[PDB]
Design a protein around this ligand. Sequence first.
Ligand SMILES: [Mg+2]
Ligand SMILES: [Mg+2]
Ligand SMILES: [Mg+2]
Ligand SMILES: [Mg+2]
Ligand SMILES: [Mg+2]
Ligand SMILES: [Mg+2]
Ligand SMILES: [Mg+2]
Ligand SMILES: [Mg+2]
Ligand SMILES: [Mg+2]
Ligand SMILES: [Mg+2]
Ligand SMILES: [Zn+2]
Lengths: 146, 61, 175, 229, 129
Amino acid sequence: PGKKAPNGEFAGRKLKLKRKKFRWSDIRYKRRVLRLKEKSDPLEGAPQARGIVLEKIAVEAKQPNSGMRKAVRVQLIKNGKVVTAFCPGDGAIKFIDEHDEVIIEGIGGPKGGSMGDIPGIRYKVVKVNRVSLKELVKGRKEKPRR
Amino acid sequence: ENVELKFEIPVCTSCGREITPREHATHFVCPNCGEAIIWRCETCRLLAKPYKCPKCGWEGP
Amino acid sequence: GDPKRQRKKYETPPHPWIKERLDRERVLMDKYELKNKKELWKHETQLKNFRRRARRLLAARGKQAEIEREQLLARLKRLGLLPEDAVLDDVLSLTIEDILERRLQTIVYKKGLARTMRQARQLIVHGHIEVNGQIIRSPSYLVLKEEEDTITYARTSPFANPQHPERMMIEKAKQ
Amino acid sequence: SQEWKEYAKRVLDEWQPKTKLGMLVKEGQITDIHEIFRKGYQIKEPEIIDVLLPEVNARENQEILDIALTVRMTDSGRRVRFRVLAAVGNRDGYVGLGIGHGREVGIAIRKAINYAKLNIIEIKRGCGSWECRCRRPHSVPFTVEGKEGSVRVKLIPGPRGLGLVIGDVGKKILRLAGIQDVWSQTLGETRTTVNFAKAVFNALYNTNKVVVTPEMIERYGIVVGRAMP
Amino acid sequence: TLLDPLANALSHITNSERVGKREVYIKPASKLIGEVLRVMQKYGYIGEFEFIDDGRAGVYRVQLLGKINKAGAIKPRFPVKARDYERWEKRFLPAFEFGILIVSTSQGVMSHKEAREKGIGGRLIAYVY
RNA sequence: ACGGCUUUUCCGGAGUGUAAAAAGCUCCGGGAAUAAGGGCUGGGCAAGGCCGGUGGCAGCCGCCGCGGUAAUACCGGCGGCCCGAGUGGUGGCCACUAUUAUUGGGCCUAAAGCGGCCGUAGCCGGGCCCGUAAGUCCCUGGCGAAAUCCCACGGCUCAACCGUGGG
RNA sequence: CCCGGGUAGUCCUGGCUGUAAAGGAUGCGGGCUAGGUGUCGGGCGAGCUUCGAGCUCGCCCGGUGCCGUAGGGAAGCCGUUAA
RNA sequence: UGGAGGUGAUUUAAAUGCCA
Ligand SMILES: [Mg+2]
Ligand SMILES: [Mg+2]
Ligand SMILES: [Mg+2]
Ligand SMILES: [Mg+2]
Ligand SMILES: [Mg+2]
Ligand SMILES: [Mg+2]
Ligand SMILES: [Mg+2]
Ligand SMILES: [Mg+2]
Ligand SMILES: [Mg+2]
Ligand SMILES: [Mg+2]
Ligand SMILES: [Zn+2]
C-alpha cells in the first residue's frame, strides 16, 4: 500500500465515486435502501398485531437447559400468515382456548430475532379478549368471554 | 513559589535538547581543564558524537 | 420543512448511576430541600449555558462579538452572581453553589423570615412574602440584586403583626 | 501537614542505608526532592523518597486500580496468584506506578505499593487550550501523545472547569497529579486496564519531551513540580 | 519522480534532526525554498545558509540547532478565506500559537502571525512547530 | 405521642370577567381537613450474605447466565434503592461504531494485491526569465421572503408565550 | 497401502484451452535516516608474480546473502533489497 | 555464538469410548 487513492486536488469526482461504491459492501445500508425488512415480515413492519389461535403445542429449549415451554399458533388477520406465539407467566396456558383473539408483540433481542433459550420463536403475548396478561399472571382481574 | 528561577534544567553539550528526568545522561568535570562541567544526553551519547570544553580548545572524546 | 417544536429546557445525565455522583449531589438534594431531581438540573443547565457562552466569545473577535460579550457582564453582575468587576475569565470560576443561593427559598431564609428551609417554602407558597411591592408564589424565583433588601411580609397576611403567635415563635430563634 | 513532617524525624533516625544515595540523603546535603531527578541517579531503596516526599503515605495519594487473578497448571492441579495495579503520588506534581505480584491479596497490595514508589517521576503543567488563556496550572500545556501495547492516546488542553473527561480507569491516575481538565482521543483497546494505565502514564512522562524556548515559558505558565505552596 | 522540490526537503530535514545531525544539503533549489528558509530563520530556527550553485539548480548548505520538533508538509494545498484560522490551527499545532503556519498570499510569503494583522489569506504550504 | 399555626388545593358565597357563558382573578365563610403509584432488589449498574414455598419441575433470561433437597439469580413475605403525577413493554433514526474514515481505517501470516506486461482516457508532473488575469485573495454594488435559531430589554405575577432592538 | 502385468498420456508438426500453494503468501515509481560482515560483473589504485587473459590488498558503482542500532508491529519479527 | 539451506535415507498386523 501507498499514500491514498485520489489524494489530489481536482479528482474529487473519482473520490465521490470511490465512496459511493465502497459504501455498498456494508450490511445495514443495504437492508434499508432495498427495504428488505419490508416484504419478508409477517406484520409488514409494525409494532403490534391481532390474531386468532389454532392449536396448543410445546417446545424444547437450547442445548444446556431443560424443559418444555408452552406455545400457541396464531393465524393472522392482516395477511393470513400463520405465526408462532409464546406466552410468559407461569401456567398462563390455563386460559388460551381455541379461537380466542389475542395480540402479538416482538421479543426484542439480538437484531430483533429470538432471545435466550427458546431460539425458534419471535413473538409473545400481551392481551387476550382485551385483557392485559400481566394481570392474569397474578390474577387480580377476571376474564370476559368465559 | 518564591520563584527565583529556582532550579534549572541542565542542558546537554553535544545534543542541545535539555535533559529528561530519567535519561541516563552523565556528568563529569572536563578533562584537561578541571573547571567546566559537561553533560551528555542519552541518545546524544549512544552514537558517539564529539564535544568540546567551552573554555579549553581540546575537542572530542 | 417541519413545524417548530418546544424544546425541553435542560439536560438529563449521561449515565444516572455513577455511584459517587449520586452520593455527591445527594447532600445538596437535602441541604436545600428540593423536591424532584429535575428541580436541580434545570439550574445546572442554566450554569452550563453561561459557561458555553463564556468560552466562545473568548475565541472570536469582531464588532458584534465584542459587544455581545461585553453586554454580558452587565447581566451576570446585575443578577448578583458576580463581584462588581470580575473581568471575563472569572466567569468560569463559578459553581453550582452560587446559583443555588439566589433561590427565593434560601434568600427568604438567610434573612430570618422563618425557622428552617422546609418551612420558608410553605410560608411563600401560601402567599405571605412579597417582592418590591408584589406577591410572588414561586419557590424558584431568582431574586435580583436590586431587590434583596426591599422584602417584607404581606399587607394582608395573618403574620404581618407581631402578635400572630406563630410569628412570635420566629423571633425566639433569632439571636 | 504536621504528621507529614513528624514522619521525617520518625524515619531518618530508624534506618541505615545499604546503597549510596541512601547516605547522600541521610547526611544533610541533598534535602529537596526536586534536585535528585534530572541527573541520572539510581533509586533502589524506597525510603529516600519518603524522607523527602513524606505525604506519599497518606492513603489519599495512594490509589488501587484493580485486582486480577491469574492461573497456571501443573500436573497436580492449578496454581494461582494475584496481580494488582497500584499507583501513587502526591496531589501536587509527582506520580509513580507499579504492578507487583504475590500469592495473597495483601502481600500483593503491599509489594505493589512499594514498587510504585521508585519509578515515580515528575511533570510539567500549564494552560494553553484556545479558551483558558489564564496562567494557572489547571490543564496539560500542549497536545501530546504516548503509545503502548496496542493503544495510542493524545491529550488536549481545556478550559478551567470542564471536569475530567477520560475513561474510568484514567480519571484516578489523572486526578492524582491533579490534572483536572483535559480532553481525550482514544485508539486501540481500552479493556486491558494495564496497557491503558501505562500508556496514559507514558504520555504524562513525554510531557517533558518537547522543547519550549525561553519566551514561551510565559505563555502557558509552564511549571515544574510544586508551584505556590 | 522529482514530483516535489519541497516535501522531499522538509521530510529529509525532519529526519536529519531526528538522528541528531548538524549539517544538511537541500538537493534541488527553487527560489521559493530560499524564501521559506528566510521566513523560517527570522524566528530563530536554523543557522546561517548560503547558495552554492555548481551549474544546475544549485544546492543548499544550512546548519542546525537540533531544534525543531517536527516539520511536515500540507499537500492538498488549501486556500483559506482570511477568517478561518482557528479551524486550521486545531489541526497542525500543540497550542493556540505554539509555532507557525506559513502562507502564500498576494504580497509574497509571510507568516500568519503577521498575515492576520494585515488581514489576508490564501494557499498554505506547510508547517513548522 | 401531645400542644400551637396555615389555607395554595377542596366545599359554600359575592364582586369582575364574558357576544351570552365558562374558566380563571380580588374578597369573605368553613375547616389537616380534599390529594401516591411505577421499576427495580446475582456482574454490567444504585441497591438483602433477610426470612418462607419449589425439586434439571414448573420459571427467569436485552448478553454472560441460574433451578440436582442448603437457590443473595424462580414463587412469595419481610425488609431495601432509583424517579416522582409518572414510571414501564414492542417497533423505527442518530450517537456511541476510526464496524463507511477528506480530517480519520486497512490488505506477510487473521477479510483483503489482479499469474505476470505494454499502453488509451482520466488523474499527479524539473529548474530559469518575460507576459495573461481565467483559478485565487481583498475592498466593494445588487441580491438570497416572513416565520424558525442566539443575544439582552421591555408586558402578562417571573417561566413559557408576545414585541421593540442586534446578530 | 505391497507385488506382476498392462490402455489413454508423456514424445514430433499446426492448433484451441488461459487453470495453480501462478508463494518474497509483501502491487510500482521517487528522497531521506548508523555501523559490521561475504560474493558475481566492471573499473580505478598498490604489490607481487612460471610474466598467464595470473595471484594478494585496498576504494567507486551495480545484483544476490547473514548478524544487528534509531524507529515500527498484537507479536512471530523488518532494519538503505523496510513491514 | 545460533542457524540458515541441500542429498539421501527414514519399518509387519494395532479400529473405538456414558454421567454430572
Ligand atoms: Mg426475591
Ligand atoms: Mg453496587
Ligand atoms: Mg478495523
Ligand atoms: Mg515544477
Ligand atoms: Mg427569514
Ligand atoms: Mg413583569
Ligand atoms: Mg421575564
Ligand atoms: Mg425564549
Ligand atoms: Mg416570539
Ligand atoms: Mg505396515
Ligand atoms: Zn489556565
